[PDB]
C-alpha cells in the first residue's frame, strides 16, 4: 500500500541520483569541486556516497517484495 510505494519510488531514484553524483566527484568534475568552498578530495566523498546509495537499494528491494505480495 501507500506506506510501501513511498519508499519504493523515493529509494528508486536515490540509487540513481546519488550514483550519478558519486561518479562526478570521483572524476573530479569542475562544477562539483571547482570552487574553493567545495571539498578538496573528490573520491573520498564518492566513497561515502556509493555506500549511501546501497542503503536506499536495500529499502527498494525489500519494499518491492512487500508490495509484490
Amino acid at each position: 500500500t501507500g506506506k510501501a510505494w513511498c519508499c519504493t519510488v523515493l529509494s528508486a531514484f536515490g540509487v540513481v541520483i546519488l550514483s550519478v553524483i558519486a561518479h562526478l566527484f570521483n572524476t573530479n568534475h569542475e562544477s562539483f569541486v571547482g570552487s574553493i568552498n567545495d571539498p578538496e578530495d573528490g573520491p573520498a566523498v564518492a566513497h561515502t556516497v556509493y555506500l549511501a546509495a546501497l542503503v536506499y537499494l536495500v529499502f527498494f528491494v525489500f519494499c518491492g517484495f512487500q508490495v509484490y505480495l
Partner: protein
C-alpha cells in the same frame, strides 16, 4: 463526407416535426436514444400549470417522492442497495430499443402507493415499542444504584440530559433559598432518540424535600425541561421487587420487538433489489412529457408540432431510425420531417476526442463561442503548456511531471472503470495537459541549462579564462565563440550571473507576448472575412494594428537589431531602450545615443501614425451607421472600445513579465534548497557522514516533489491560463453563444 468541428463550430439545421397524438409517446423514446436533438420551447408564454401534460407529470412526480421515502428507511438501516445493469438499456452509442407499455407504468403507481401504506404503519408499530423500551431501561438503570444515592414523599427522582443538569440545579437553589440537597449520577453510553434522531448523553438526579407545596413545583420544573420522573421505593426490598417486574417485562419486550422488526426488514429486501430499475423507468417517462410539453397541440387535428436543432451531417441517420420505428408498428404515416430555414441563433458544438476535450473544457469555462467563429481551443493545445515551461523551466522537475501523468495515461482503462474522487478527476481529466507541460519543460530547461539547480557540460564553451591566476583574484573571461544550444555553462557559479539572465529573460518575455498577441489578432480578420463584415476591417482591424505595431513592434525590432551589432568593435556606445521608448513620446526629434541612421525621422512618423489611428478608430464606423438614439448606441460602444484597446495594449504587454518573475523565483529556491540540504552532507565522513546523506537526500526529494512541483506548478499553470483568457482571447473571442445540450437518457445516480 462527415465534417470536423474543431477549427470552427459545426453547421446546424432547424427541423420541424409533424407527430400524430397516437405515436407521440413512442417517438419521444427514440429521439432520446439518439442524443442529437435540442428542442426549443414554443409554448414559452403559457403559464406552468396551464400546460397540457401537467396532469400526467404529477402521477410520476408522486412516485419519485414515494421512492425517496424508501431510500431513506434503507439508509436509516445498514442495508446496501442492489446495483443492476447500467448498460442493459443502451451502451451510449445511439442504439434502438422498444419502450415500456402504458399499463406497466400504471402498475408502478398502485404498487408504490400500496407499499407506502404498509411501511408507514410497520414503522410506527416499531417505534412505539422502542419508546416503551427506553423508558424502562432508565427505570432499570436507576434501581441498580445503591442506597447512598437515597441517603441525604421524601424525595424526587428521574433522568435528564447532561446539558440541562446545571440549569436545573441553579433554579432549585433559588426556589428553596439555599436548602438544596442534590445528587447526580452519570451514564457513559449515549442514548438514541427516535423522534429527535440523536445520540444523547444522560444523567440521573435526585432531590430531597419535605414540603408538599414545594414538590409539585419541583415536579413541574423538571418536566418543563425534558425529564422523565419515576417512582422508587425507599426500602431495599421494594427496589428489587420492582426491579424483577421490570427485568421481566423487558425480557418480554425484546421478543415483541424482535418479531415486528424482522417482518419490517423482510419487506425492504424485496424493495432493495427492485428499486434502481423502477426509478430509471420513471425518470425517463418524465423526460419525454416535458419535451412533449414544449410542443404545440392542435385541437383541430391530432398533429403535434415541434422544433429542434440537429447537425446537418447527422440528418440522414435521423430519417433512417424513424423509418425503422414506423416499420415495426405497421402504420402508414406521411413524411414526419420537414427542414425549416429561419433567422435564429443556432447552438454551438465542437466535436472533441480524448486529447482535445481537456483543452476545450478550459475555454468553455470563460465562455461559449459564437456560431461559426474561430475556436480558442486549437491554439491552446500548444500555447498553454509552452508558457508554463518558460516559467517552470527545468529538466528535473519536468521529468517528474512527465512520469506522474504517464502513469495516468497507460492505466486509463483501469482508472476509468473504477470510481474516483474530486481531486483525482481533474488530474485524470487533464492527464494529457500534464504530459505536454513535462515534455516542453525538458526542452526549456535544456536551453536554460538547469537540471536540479545544476548545469550540463555537453559542448565546448565560448568563453575562456586566463592562462594563469592565483587564489582570491577576481578573474574575467575572454570570448572565443558562440555556444550553439542554450546558455553557456561558464555563467554557472559566476558573480555577475543574474545581470545577464535577467536582461535575457525580460527580452524573451516581451518578444514572446508580442507574437502571442498579434497572432491572436489575425483571428479577428479571419472572422470578418467569413461573415463578410467589410467595414469592421477598415474600422477596427487596420487602425488597431498600426497602433501597437508602430509602438510595440518598433520595440521588438530594436531588441533583435541591438543583439546583432558589435558595439565595442565599432566603438559606438550601446543605447538604452527604455529611455529611447520614453523620449520619442516626450521629446521627439531628440536623441542621446543612436541605434541606426535616420532614427529621429522615423520615430516622429510613427508617433504621427498612431495619433491618426485614434480618431479613425473612434469615428469611422458610427458615421457609416448614420449614412447607412440608435446612433448613440453605436457610438458609446465604439468610444469605450478605443479607450480600452489603447490602455490594454500597455497593461497586457506589461503582464507578460510574469514569465520572467516566476522563472527567476523557481530557480533561486531550487539552489537554496540544494545549498542548505545536500551540500552539507558532502562535508562529512565516516558512518555519521553516511547517515546524513541518507537523511538529507530524503528531505531534499520530498520538499522538491511538493514545494517546487505541486505548489509552483499550480501557480504557473494558472498564470498561463490567465494570459489566454484575458490577453489572447480578448483580441478575437466574442462569446455569448448558446451551448449544445441535446435530449438524451443517462444513468441517474440517485
Amino acid at each position: 463526407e462527415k465534417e470536423e468541428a474543431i477549427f470552427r463550430s459545426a453547421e446546424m439545421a432547424l427541423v420541424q416535426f409533424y407527430i400524430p397524438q397516437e405515436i407521440s409517446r413512442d417517438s419521444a423514446y427514440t429521439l432520446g436514444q439518439l442524443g442529437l436533438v435540442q428542442f426549443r420551447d414554443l409554448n414559452s408564454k403559457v403559464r406552468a400549470f396551464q400546460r397540457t401534460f401537467v396532469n400526467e407529470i404529477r402521477r410520476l412526480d408522486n412516485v419519485e417522492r414515494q421512492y425517496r421515502y424508501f431510500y431513506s428507511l434503507l439508509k436509516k438501516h445498514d442495508i446496501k442497495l442492489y446495483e443492476g445493469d447500467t448498460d442493459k438499456y443502451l451502451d451510449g452509442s445511439g442504439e434502438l430499443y422498444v419502450p415500456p407499455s402504458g399499463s406497466v407504468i400504471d402498475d408502478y403507481v398502485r404498487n408504490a402507493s400500496y407499499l407506502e401504506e404498509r411501511l408507514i404503519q410497520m414503522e410506527d408499530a416499531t417505534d412505539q415499542i422502542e419508546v416503551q423500551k427506553n423508558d424502562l431501561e432508565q427505570y432499570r438503570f436507576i434501581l441498580q444504584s445503591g442506597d447512598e444515592f437515597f441517603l441525604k414523599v421524601n424525595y424526587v427522582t428521574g433522568v435528564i440530559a447532561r446539558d440541562k443538569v446545571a440549569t436545573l440545579e441553579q433554579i432549585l437553589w433559588r426556589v428553596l433559598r439555599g436548602n438544596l440537597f442534590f445528587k447526580t449520577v452519570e451514564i457513559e453510553q449515549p442514548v438514541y432518540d427516535v423522534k429527535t434522531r440523536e445520540y444523547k448523553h444522560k444523567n440521573a438526579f435526585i432531590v430531597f424535600s419535605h414540603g408538599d407545596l414545594i414538590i409539585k413545583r419541583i415536579r413541574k420544573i423538571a418536566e418543563s425541561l425534558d425529564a422523565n420522573l419515576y417512582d422508587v421505593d425507599s426500602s431495599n426490598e421494594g427496589r428489587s421487587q420492582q426491579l424483577a417486574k421490570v427485568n421481566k417485562n423487558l425480557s418480554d419486550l425484546y421478543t415483541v420487538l424482535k418479531t415486528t422488526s424482522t417482518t419490517l426488514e423482510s419487506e425492504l429486501y424485496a424493495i432493495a433489489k427492485e428499486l434502481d430499475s423502477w426509478f430509471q423507468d420513471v425518470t425517463r417517462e418524465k423526460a419525454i412529457f416535458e419535451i412533449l410539453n414544449k410542443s404545440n397541440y392542435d385541437t383541430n387535428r391530432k398533429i403535434l408540432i415541434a422544433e429542434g436543432w440537429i447537425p446537418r451531417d447527422e440528418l440522414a441517420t435521423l430519417q433512417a431510425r424513424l423509418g425503422e420505428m414506423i416499420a415495426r408498428l405497421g402504420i402508414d404515416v406521411p413524411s414526419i420531417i420537414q427542414v425549416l430555414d429561419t433567422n435564429h441563433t443556432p447552438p454551438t458544438f465542437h466535436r472533441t476526442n480524448k486529447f482535445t476535450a481537456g483543452f476545450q473544457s478550459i475555454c468553455d469555462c470563460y465562455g461559449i463561442a459564437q456560431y461559426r467563429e474561430i475556436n480558442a481551443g486549437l491554439p491552446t493545445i500548444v500555447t498553454f503548456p509552452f508558457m508554463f515551461a518558460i516559467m517552470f523551466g527545468d529538466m528535473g522537475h519536468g521529468f517528474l511531471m512527465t512520469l506522474a501523468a504517464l502513469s495516468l495515461v497507460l492505466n486509463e482503462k483501469k482508472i476509468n472503470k473504477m470510481k474516483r474522487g474530486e481531486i483525482f478527476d481533474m488530474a485524470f481529466t487533464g492527464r494529457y495537459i500534464i504530459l505536454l507541460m513535462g515534455v516542453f519543460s525538458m526542452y526549456t530547461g535544456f536551453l536554460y541549462n538547469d537540471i536540479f539547480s545544476k548545469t550540463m557540460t555537453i559542448f565546448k564553451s565560448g568563453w575562456k579564462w586566463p592562462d594563469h591566476w592565483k587564489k582570491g583574484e577576481s578573474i574575467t573571461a575572454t570570448s572565443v565563440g558562440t555556444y550553439p544550444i542554450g546558455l553557456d555553462w561558464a555563467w554557472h557559479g559566476t558573480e555577475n550571473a543574474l545581470l545577464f539572465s535577467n536582461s535575457y529573460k525580460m527580452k524573451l518575455s516581451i518578444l514572446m507576448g508580442f507574437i502571442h498577441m498579434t497572432y491572436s489578432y489575425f483571428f479577428s480578420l479571419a472572422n470578418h472575412l467569413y461573415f463578410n463584415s467589410m467595414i469592421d476591417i477598415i474600422g477596427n482591424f487596420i487602425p488597431g494594428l498600426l497602433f501597437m505595431q508602430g509602438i510595440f513592434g518598433y520595440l521588438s525590432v530594436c531588441i533583435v537589431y541591438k543583439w546583432a551589432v558589435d558595439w565595442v568593435k565599432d566603438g559606438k556606445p550601446a543605447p538604452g531602450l527604455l529611455n529611447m521608448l520614453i523620449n520619442m513620446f516626450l521629446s521627439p526629434g531628440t536623441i542621446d545615443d543612436e541605434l541606426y541612421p535616420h532614427q529621429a525621422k522615423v520615430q516622429v512618423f510613427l508617433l504621427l501614425m498612431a495619433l491618426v489611428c485614434i480618431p479613425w478608430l473612434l469615428l469611422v464606423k458610427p458615421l457609416h451607421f448614420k449614412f447607412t438614439e440608435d446612433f448613440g448606441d453605436i457610438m458609446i460602444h465604439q468610444v469605450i472600445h478605443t479607450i480600452e484597446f489603447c490602455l490594454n495594449c500597455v497593461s497586457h504587454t506589461a503582464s507578460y513579465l510574469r514569465l520572467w518573475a516566476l522563472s527567476l523565483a523557481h530557480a533561486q529556491l531550487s539552489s537554496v534548497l540544494w545549498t542548505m540540504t545536500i551540500q552539507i552532507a558532502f562535508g562529512f565522513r565516516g558512518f555519521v557522514g553516511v547517515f546524513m546523506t541518507v537523511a538529507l537526500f530524503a528531505m531534499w526529494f520530498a520538499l522538491t516533489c511538493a514545494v517546487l512541483v505541486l505548489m509552483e506548478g499550480t501557480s504557473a499553470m494558472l498564470h498561463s491560463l490567465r494570459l489566454h483568457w484575458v490577453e489572447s482571447m480578448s483580441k478575437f473571442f466574442v462569446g455569448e453563444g448558446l451551448p449544445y445540450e441535446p435530449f438524451a437518457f443517462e444513468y441517474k445516480d440517485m
